Ligand binder design. Structure first.
Ligand SMILES: [Ca+2]
Ligand SMILES: [Ca+2]
Lengths: 539, 163, 23, 90
């Protein structure tokens, strides 16, 4: 009905709703109508789609059992099933729709392929899939948000192997740090290296790894952070030219940084609105953008010498933001990652707890004010006292100074009782409500924690892999080279892989069936039927 | 095999410290620093006294547990100290314009985060400074600290502890 | 030997043999 | 595995051999070229059989069990049981 502006709809509308579900995955399905008498190009896939759309599980499983390119289809089906759960009109059907469980079959099959010939499993995982409009498996895995699939051991092994590039090895951390510190030690055999121009290629293969680029970027970031702290500490001078030197240096640094950020956010694209949405998707980019906004406000400060102080405070806030951004490295470490994710998860309820505690604080302060003394000549001093008292509760200083003076004694005991009630109920709740959800996310959501950590690992890895192969200063030269290049401008092993995949799938299915066959309950059922038949035939 | 044991390793480092103390006793001009070295060596010898706690059935497993959970606490302290420093540097700009002597600033900026655990909260300079826009930011940052550190230092700890 | 699963397996084999021999 | 278990069932000086086998199995896990074989290699579980047998001997005549535990083992080049237990980090 919307497009037009024995049922009427044809295969055109089916292709349209499919593209609506998956844009880059299956945009070209059923290329307006062709000749109906023509045979199908890939029958099993079409039947699989028709089955899974009508929410007919067993039919879909069977159709999948007779088709090629298994894991890709299994992930796409999970995507479509999870999609057709919010658009459901009946909650009864919505529950069973949300009970699809295709990702389980996908992971099971992929484990079966990974068990043997993992060297081919890795090729499959990045192989182009022919039926689904030339789309890689990881793209579908991402579009389906299949966190469970990433958590697979083979996926993590592939991530690790890509994390070290061609120079992969065991590579102890200290040995790597030393080899990076000693530019000549790399030519020696300090670590294993996989297979005038020779030394150039060797150094290229060295710096091309992701780990070394990550270390270099974190070193440069830490160094620039320290240097900016220095320039803000002592070089915050009047607007003569000399003081502005370090300032314009930091300005150029921030310019290169924001250029690299906008490149990583906008050229990593169908539409400009698509690039904007995907850039706004990440929260790290969000704090990056707010930090650049704060730095712009600081530049506006540097423009005007009359409001230099408030703008110095703005620069201080921007530095606080840049320092908060330094926690980005804690996710990569196996010991620090999950802890950081846990701390991130438990950040919601603590805010409301602080809100309630502050509300209670204020009521106590206002009450104490009436009982403290009659009126006040200056609001300021009262502001200082009434602010410091509840703020010092955590401190434990308990400066009942004014109260002692006031007694010189009926308002003291009420204050003591209220402070005791606070130091008990807050002390209790702040860990009681905390430990429950903490152990929850740690054990019952241990899977959630590990999965989120592995997901962030994959994201960081794929982000740093495409990182520019140059210094952030030289990144300008890289962009210029790209713009200049823009202005100036197999099959048989694939069939072997496909046959191997189908064979492994058939073997896995047969093994699952045979294992189900000899279960105890099936044995009792069969023996019961048999003894009943024997008893009937005998009499 | 001798280097395999860690107890022998601290034994050897203690003998090294005692050798440095002997070298001190050789020279009367550097007697003070060497007295500090002897103090450190005595601290090491005293730390070695925990060796007996392993034999007792009640103290042994507890000592082993304390030994096991000694890795993550170091990185936690590292992160906490990093956060401490950023807050201190920020507060410095908002505190006041420049500084005539680095020393006093060193004492203040060291004592403040060190006193957070203490709870003394010597916002003395801040009170003087107001004589008032930098105070509330300091209070908010100290509250954020005394909540998030208080939370994590037992949240991340109890999981691995019960583990 | 005398585990429950082994008992069920043996009894199943036995009843199957009996059913085959009888008919 | 099964061949090794059977061969062990027909031999003397049990627990010493059972610990030495665990040592060798744990050793031949880092020197493996294929992770698939490495997993099942690391799934050896000989120390379980060693401990089970030693418990069986300890159940009766512990006065002799203690002698066995420090006895010299003839086949393994005159080596005590505890030495193998240590070298295997059992
Ligand atoms: Ca960014
Ligand atoms: Ca010693």
């Amino acid at each position: 009905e919307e497009g037009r502006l024995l049922p009427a709809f044809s295969l055109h509308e089916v292709s349209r709703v499919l593209k609506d579900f998956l844009h880059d995955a299956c945009r070209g399905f059923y290329q307006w109508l062709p000749d109906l008498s023509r045979k199908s190009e890939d029958p099993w896939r079409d039947l699989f789609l028709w089955a899974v759309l009508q929410n007919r599980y067993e039919m879909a499983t069977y159709f999948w059992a007779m088709g090629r390119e298994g894991v890709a289809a299994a992930l796409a089906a999970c995507k479509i099933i999870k999609e057709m759960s919010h658009l459901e009109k009946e909650a009864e059907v919505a529950r069973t729709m949300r009970e699809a469980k295709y990702e389980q079959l996908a992971l099971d099959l992929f484990s079966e392929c990974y068990s043997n010939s993992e060297d081919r499993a890795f090729a499959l995982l990045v192989r182009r899939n022919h039926s689904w409009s030339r789309t890689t498996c990881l793209h579908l895995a991402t579009e389906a948000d299949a966190k469970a699939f990433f958590a697979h051991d083979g996926v993590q092994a592939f991530l690790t192997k890509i994390w070290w590039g061609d120079m992969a090895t065991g590579t102890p951390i200290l040995r790597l740090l030393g080899a990076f510190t000693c530019p000549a030690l790399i030519y020696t055999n300090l670590i294993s290296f996989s297979e005038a121009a020779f030394l150039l290629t060797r150094w290229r293969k060295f710096w091309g790894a992701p780990v070394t680029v990550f270390l270099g970027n974190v070193v440069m970031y830490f160094a620039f952070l320290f240097l900016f702290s220095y320039v803000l500490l002592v070089d915050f001078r009047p607007p003569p030219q000399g003081p502005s030197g370090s300032e314009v240096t930091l300005y150029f640094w921030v310019f290169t940084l924001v250029l690299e950020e906008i490149r990583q956010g906008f050229f990593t694209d169908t539409r400009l609105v698509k690039k904007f949405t995907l850039y706004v998707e990440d929260n790290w980019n969000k704090c990056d953008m707010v930090a650049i906004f704060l730095f712009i406000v600081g530049v506006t400060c540097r423009m005007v010498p009359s409001v230099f102080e408030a703008g110095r405070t703005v620069l201080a806030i921007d530095f606080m933001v840049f320092t908060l951004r330094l926690i980005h490295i804690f996710a990569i470490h196996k010991q620090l990652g999950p802890k950081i994710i846990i701390v991130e998860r438990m950040m919601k309820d603590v805010f409301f707890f602080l809100f309630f505690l502050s509300v209670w604080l204020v009521a106590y302060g206002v009450t104490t004010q009436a009982l403290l003394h009659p009126h006040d000549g200056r609001l300021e001093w009262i502001f200082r006292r009434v602010l410091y008292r509840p703020y010092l509760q955590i401190f434990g200083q308990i400066p009942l100074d004014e109260i002692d003076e006031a007694r010189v004694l009926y308002a003291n005991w009420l204050v003591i009782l209220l402070l005791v009630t606070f130091l008990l109920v807050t002390n209790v709740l702040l860990m009681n409500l905390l430990i429950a959800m903490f152990s929850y996310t740690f054990q019952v959501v241990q899977g959630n924690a590990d999965m989120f950590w592995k997901f962030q690992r994959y994201h960081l890895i794929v982000e740093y892999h495409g990182r520019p192969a140059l210094a952030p200063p030289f990144i300008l030269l890289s962009h210029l080279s790209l713009v200049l290049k823009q202005v100036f401008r197999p099959d048989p092993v694939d069939q072997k892989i496909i046959t191997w995949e189908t064979v492994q799938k058939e073997n896995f299915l047969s093994t699952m069936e045979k294992r189900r066959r000899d279960s105890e309950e099936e044995v009792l059922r069969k023996t019961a039927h048999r003894v009943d038949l024997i008893a009937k035939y005998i009499g």
